[PDB]
């Protein structure tokens, strides 16, 4: 249904990922949404020695019909705390997804670069300013905050409960635990200003 230099590239790049050593080791993975191959669901495992370790992140991959001369539009379906990824929408700030895309890049190399992006964030050049300045000003707070998002959203081992007690305390006020994890983390785990931010209207 596409111009096929996409259909042929996508089909062999798709078949390239399932045959790879990274899929055999469960690092990356790609799947079919429909069977025209213009939308794919990718999955990358959180890199080791990073707060995302033990987590698996779903990725929305939409192949434009200018493929392979324009990059695929990738968005994080799974929530993640990362200065180069939106904590709200999952938008990705990577140059290979914008100006620095090359036609030689494949599905595998895009997934491997995104998995690499989790290991090496660029806070000076961010997608989420809130996550980025917490990353710079408080390195340890970001690490466990990303660790907590890593379990609540990507099924990792739990971050240790010095942070959940607040998540417990604000829920004792009947608040949405989804709104509380967002409010507490953006306000750098200050319950006061989180409670003041907690209320929309």
């Amino acid at each position: 249904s596409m111009a096929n230099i996409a259909v042929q590239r996508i089909k062999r790049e798709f078949k390239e990922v399932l045959k790879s050593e990274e899929t055999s080791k469960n690092q990356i993975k790609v799947d079919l949404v429909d069977e025209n191959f213009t939308e794919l669901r990718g999955e990358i495992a959180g890199p080791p020695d990073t707060p995302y370790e033990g987590g698996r992140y779903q990725l929305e991959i939409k192949i434009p019909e200018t493929y392979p001369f324009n990059p695929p539009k990738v968005r994080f379906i799974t929530k993640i705390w990362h200065p180069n990824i939106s904590s709200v929408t999952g938008a990705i700030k990577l140059d290979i997804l914008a100006d620095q895309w090359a036609a030689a890049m494949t599905l595998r190399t895009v997934l491997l670069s995104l998995q690499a992006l989790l290991a090496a964030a660029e806070p000076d050049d961010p997608q989420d300013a809130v996550v980025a300045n917490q990353y710079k000003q408080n390195p340890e707070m970001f690490k466990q905050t990303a660790r907590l998002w890593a379990h609540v959203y990507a099924g990792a081992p739990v971050s240790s409960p010095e942070y959940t007690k607040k998540i417990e305390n604000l829920c004792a006020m009947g608040f949405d635990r989804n709104a509380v994890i967002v409010a507490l983390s953006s306000k750098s785990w200050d319950v006061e200003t989180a409670t003041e931010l907690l209320l929309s209207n």
Partner: protein, 76 residues
């Protein structure tokens, strides 16, 4: 005429321009001298950006006036 573009790294870029010129073309001859893509760079004068459609004399940038180049964010 001669204008300057002070940059990161204490670099000083010297360009021969006309007040007639787009800010886009000022970016274009920074590209030939520095190998910097024009839509990843932004020039500030009097501490203000100048949109590519406008020209330098609209911002009364006379000769020997100093500009500063902040480069657009990577991702970005």
């Amino acid at each position: 005429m001669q204008i300057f573009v002070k940059t990161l790294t204490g670099k000083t870029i010297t360009l021969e321009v006309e007040p007639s010129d787009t800010i886009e073309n000022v970016k274009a001859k920074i590209q030939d001298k520095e190998g910097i893509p024009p839509d990843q760079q932004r020039l500030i004068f009097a501490g203000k950006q100048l949109e590519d459609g406008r020209t330098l004399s609209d911002y009364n940038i006379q000769k020997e006036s100093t500009l500063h180049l902040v480069l657009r964010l990577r991702g970005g």
